[PDB]
Write a protein that binds this ligand. Structure first.
Ligand SMILES: [Mg+2]
Ligand SMILES: [Mg+2]
Ligand SMILES: [Mg+2]
Ligand SMILES: [Mg+2]
Ligand SMILES: [Mg+2]
Ligand SMILES: [Mg+2]
Ligand SMILES: [Mg+2]
Ligand SMILES: [Mg+2]
Ligand SMILES: [Mg+2]
Ligand SMILES: [Mg+2]
Ligand SMILES: [Mg+2]
Ligand SMILES: [Mg+2]
Ligand SMILES: [Mg+2]
Ligand SMILES: [Mg+2]
Ligand SMILES: [Mg+2]
Ligand SMILES: [Mg+2]
Ligand SMILES: [Mg+2]
Ligand SMILES: [Mg+2]
Ligand SMILES: [Mg+2]
Ligand SMILES: [Mg+2]
Ligand SMILES: [Mg+2]
Ligand SMILES: [Mg+2]
Ligand SMILES: [Mg+2]
Ligand SMILES: [Mg+2]
Ligand SMILES: [Mg+2]
Ligand SMILES: [Mg+2]
Ligand SMILES: [Mg+2]
Ligand SMILES: [Mg+2]
Ligand SMILES: [Mg+2]
Ligand SMILES: [Mg+2]
Ligand SMILES: [Mg+2]
Ligand SMILES: [Mg+2]
Ligand SMILES: [Mg+2]
Ligand SMILES: [Mg+2]
Ligand SMILES: [Mg+2]
Ligand SMILES: [Mg+2]
Ligand SMILES: [Mg+2]
Ligand SMILES: [Mg+2]
Ligand SMILES: [Mg+2]
Lengths: 142, 117, 150, 23, 102, 109, 55
RNA sequence: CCCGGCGAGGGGAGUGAAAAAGAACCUGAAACCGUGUACGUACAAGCAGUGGGAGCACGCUUAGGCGUGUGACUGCGUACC
RNA sequence: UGUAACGGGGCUAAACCAUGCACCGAAGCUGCGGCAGCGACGCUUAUGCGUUGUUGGGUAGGGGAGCGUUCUGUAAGCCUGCGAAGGUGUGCUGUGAGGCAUGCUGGAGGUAUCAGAAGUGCGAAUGCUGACAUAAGUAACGAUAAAGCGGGUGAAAAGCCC
């Protein structure tokens, strides 16, 4: 007997809110990636996103230990010849403070179509006020 | 004797092309490339009759890990608790129970916890 | 193969294959690669082997009960109508009548029947003595073949 | 009528080397 | 009210009145097999786990039909080294129908 | 009744005629005759003649009215290419191909 | 200057997708001579915007 | 007899066992080129398959069950001599 | 060329040490069937019936067992116009080369069984011939002496005739 395979028409999704005013970036992002792939759900399948929508309010006070707030650097290539742009942690915070959590979970998540779908279910905010209160999201200690 | 060999080649190439229907491109109309597609496809079938059991072992293990952490135990502590309570229920059955009928899985979790502690 | 002897093109410097005779067995209207010959295929069975085979099938005919023995075979005039009449009287369809002595009237009467065979006891052969279903033997032919095999 | 003006392609004449050769 | 039972290595989760597909039992074509190695009964939060077998339990079943399963081809092939090898296989399977559950 | 009309060994090539086929595959026949009147290719001449023949056969044999007709199916198949030789530089020949088409027009209501 | 592999009928159909024609949209039917012609073009009989200009 | 250019080619009628035997003529395969229908395909990376697999449509019945066509998504997977 | 000397996200442990307990982890081993070979040993031999232990990755190569095609004998026998070969589909079956049955097309041959003989099996030889692709409806239309208008002809005139 072919065991259970969760059909994407009948699987249901919840809504979670994560506080991030001092969580460590790597551990927080790993737990976001775990709930986003859906591995807290017993109807789990690889080829079907059984994930859960996660709203990370206050995504700029994510605290990083070590000397990483002045030493951890981020690289992205433009596409031209000399274009290797590079910004530290505090400078990436000062430019666009949600890109840090988005790059972290975009590193941890799978790659390709389903990985980009699981990332599409992750929307983060640099403040304390979201606009998805019509969804009834529940808080989650993560 | 002069064995003319049209019909033999037609029968053989028809068998291989019928095996190679469904494939993209010239790999379902050309014979010289449908033979490579057939032989490489049979090679992958021979590898995947071993790989399917690997993949489904990992799928059952992931599902039991998810249901066990929903009931308050890790998977390794779960399986050691089951072997210490002397249950031989394999993990295909465990994962199918974990999806269909979850209160029996809570029964398995409490018996494993009472064994391990 | 009736052709030329030149190379159809030069060896190096053309985008075509290497080729040096238009007669070649890989070409079109080239030779057969391993062409045959008028030959002789006569297998040589030994004298005692051939006689042992004839002894074997005569013993097999008498064990399988297919060698009807008669004192003589005789028709008056060479009428195949009378020969088929006589054979239907004797109740046979496929029949080999190997003769004690020479009967040219039976030659003439069996030349046109398409199932009956008339021989000598000397000129017998295992293909005939196996293939024909009911072998009729003259007692004089029995004497001649007991001489012939001894 | 039916002329059928399709004679066979006897095309290749010769060649040469005539190229800057690495040597 | 299902039951999990073991028939030659592979374990099955079957309910009453189901059919299931075992590997070839040496039992005649219309006879009943009574499996003894019942490992789990479940009756709507009325479970009892076998340790390693349930004591009070058998599973009765009738052998519906024997047969040979789907042919699967096996091609071994070593590239550039002049060897390939076709083969066939057809497993003998045996359908049983579960009636008794305890 | 679907009335068919063919033109075999049309002296043009299939890839050229299939454009003017794809223009009017599916229309009504009067509007298709307008389109093939004011389309300015040689395939318009050819398929306009074949649509004239198909309308004429459908009205005369089966006896249906001209407004009812509608080009359900129309296609252009490859035909027997005739093979000439164009001589080109440095002695080499080049076999050039003169292709042909089998133009089929189904017309019905 | 010459190709490296043989391109599929998929690629050939995709390239030929653009070379297909567009029809003439709608012929102007002249008011007083009832016949079709192109926009701003004189007809076969010779009319254009009503009057016969030509022989 | 009709379309057409008093052409080519076709459509009906006719001989015909057969015209999908019509001279470009028995059988009529494959590459190749189209048409009609079902499914997929315009956020997507690579020997193009294979294991899994939802959906859709078409065929069947102790509704259950399936097959046949497709294959989104996914683990593996760097042609042949 | 572009971080680029963890594989990557990232980690002050998710680093290193020392002691464990668990688990994951291969086509290994065990379980369940299935096939073959080689050994033992009795048998009850149509010369393999019951077990039995053990073996089966494979190039060059050596050995063994077969399938299929054409023709000859078996064959003036059998199937076949109530439809043979061949072609195209499906379903069953065989360890594989394969085999059988059938629906459509075809319109006259085919051949069991056991033997015999081979021009006996194609994917590769810059192989040979035929056919059809591809580049592609792309380059080109062959002197940079040059054309334009009216009238005729026709279904159709830039090129023909005036
Ligand atoms: Mg021959
Ligand atoms: Mg095909
Ligand atoms: Mg394993
Ligand atoms: Mg010489
Ligand atoms: Mg010749
Ligand atoms: Mg010759
Ligand atoms: Mg002698
Ligand atoms: Mg010259
Ligand atoms: Mg190359
Ligand atoms: Mg174009
Ligand atoms: Mg005519
Ligand atoms: Mg032809
Ligand atoms: Mg004939
Ligand atoms: Mg024909
Ligand atoms: Mg074909
Ligand atoms: Mg899409
Ligand atoms: Mg691509
Ligand atoms: Mg599958
Ligand atoms: Mg640099
Ligand atoms: Mg383990
Ligand atoms: Mg093993
Ligand atoms: Mg075994
Ligand atoms: Mg071996
Ligand atoms: Mg013969
Ligand atoms: Mg028929
Ligand atoms: Mg033959
Ligand atoms: Mg046939
Ligand atoms: Mg004949
Ligand atoms: Mg080879
Ligand atoms: Mg070749
Ligand atoms: Mg070419
Ligand atoms: Mg082209
Ligand atoms: Mg170009
Ligand atoms: Mg250009
Ligand atoms: Mg140009
Ligand atoms: Mg010129
Ligand atoms: Mg010029
Ligand atoms: Mg003029
Ligand atoms: Mg001019």
């Amino acid at each position: 007997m072919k065991t259970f395979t969760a059909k994407p028409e009948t699987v249901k999704r919840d809504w979670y809110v994560v506080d991030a005013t001092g969580k460590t970036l790597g551990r927080l992002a790993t737990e976001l990636a775990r709930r986003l792939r859906g591995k807290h759900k017993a109807e789990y399948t690889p080829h079907v996103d059984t994930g859960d929508y996660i709203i990370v309010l206050n995504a700029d006070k994510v605290a990083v230990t070590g000397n990483k707030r002045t030493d951890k650097v981020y690289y992205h290539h433009t596409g031209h010849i000399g274009g290797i742009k590079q910004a530290t942690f505090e400078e990436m915070i000062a430019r666009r403070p949600e890109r840090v959590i988005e790059i972290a979970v975009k590193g941890m998540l799978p790659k390709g179509p389903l990985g980009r779908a699981m990332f599409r279910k992750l929307k983060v905010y640099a403040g304390n006020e979201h606009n998805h209160a019509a969804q009834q999201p529940q808080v989650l200690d993560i | 004797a002069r064995v003319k060999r049209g019909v033999i080649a037609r029968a053989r190439h028809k068998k291989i092309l019928k095996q190679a229907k469904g494939y993209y491109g010239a790999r379902s109309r050309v014979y010289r490339v449908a033979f490579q597609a057939v032989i490489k496809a049979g090679q992958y079938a021979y590898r995947d009759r071993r790989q399917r059991k690997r993949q489904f072992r990992q799928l059952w293990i992931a599902r039991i890990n998810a249901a066990a952490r929903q009931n308050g135990i890790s998977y390794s502590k779960f399986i050691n608790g089951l072997k210490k309570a002397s249950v031989e229920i394999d993990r295909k059955i465990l994962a199918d129970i974990a999806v269909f009928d979850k209160v029996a899985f809570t029964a398995l979790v409490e018996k494993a916890k009472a064994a391990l502690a | 193969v009736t052709g030329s002897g030149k190379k159809p093109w030069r060896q190096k410097g053309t985008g075509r294959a290497r080729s040096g005779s238009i007669k070649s067995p890989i070409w079109r209207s080239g030779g057969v690669t391993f062409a045959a010959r008028p030959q002789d295929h006569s297998q040589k069975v030994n004298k005692k082997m051939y006689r042992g085979a004839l002894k074997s099938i005569l013993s097999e005919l008498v064990r399988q009960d297919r060698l009807i023995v008669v004192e003589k075979f005789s028709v008056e005039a060479p009428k195949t109508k009378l020969l088929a009449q006589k054979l239907k009287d004797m109740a046979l369809e496929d029949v080999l009548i190997i003769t004690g002595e020479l009967d040219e009237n039976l030659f003439l009467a069996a030349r046109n029947l398409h199932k009956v065979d008339v021989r000598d006891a000397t000129g017998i052969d295992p293909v005939s003595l196996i293939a024909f279903d009911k072998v009729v033997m003259t007692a004089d032919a029995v004497k001649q073949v007991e001489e012939m095999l001894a | 009528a039916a002329a059928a003006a399709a004679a066979a392609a006897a095309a290749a004449a010769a060649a040469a080397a005539a190229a800057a050769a690495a040597a | 009210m299902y039951a999990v039972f073991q028939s030659g290595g592979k374990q099955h989760r079957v309910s009453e009145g189901q059919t299931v597909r075992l590997e070839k039992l040496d039992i005649a074509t219309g006879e009943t097999v009574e499996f003894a190695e019942v490992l789990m009964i479940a009756n709507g939060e009325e479970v009892k786990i076998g340790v390693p077998f349930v004591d009070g339990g058998v599973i009765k079943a009738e052998v519906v039909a024997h047969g040979r399963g789907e042919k699967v081809k096996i091609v071994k092939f070593r590239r550039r080294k002049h060897y390939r090898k076709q083969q066939g296989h057809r497993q003998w399977f045996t359908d049983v129908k579960i009636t008794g559950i305890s | 009744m679907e009335t068919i009309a063919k033109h075999r060994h049309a002296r043009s090539s299939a890839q050229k005629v299939r454009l003017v086929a794809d223009l009017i595959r599916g229309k009504k026949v009067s509007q298709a005759l307008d389109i093939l009147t004011y389309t300015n290719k040689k395939a318009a001449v050819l398929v306009k003649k074949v649509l004239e023949s198909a309308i004429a056969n459908a009205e005369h044999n089966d006896g249906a009215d001209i407004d009812d007709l509608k080009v359900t199916k129309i296609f252009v198949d490859e035909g027997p290419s005739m093979k000439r030789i164009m001589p080109r530089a440095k002695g080499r020949a080049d076999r050039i191909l003169k292709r042909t088409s089998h133009i089929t027009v189904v017309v019905s209501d | 200057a010459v190709q490296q592999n043989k391109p599929t009928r998929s690629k050939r159909g995709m390239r030929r997708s653009h070379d297909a024609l567009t029809a003439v949209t709608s012929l102007s039917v002249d008011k007083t001579s009832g016949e079709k012609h192109l926009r701003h073009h004189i007809t076969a009989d010779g009319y254009y915007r009503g009057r016969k200009v030509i022989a």
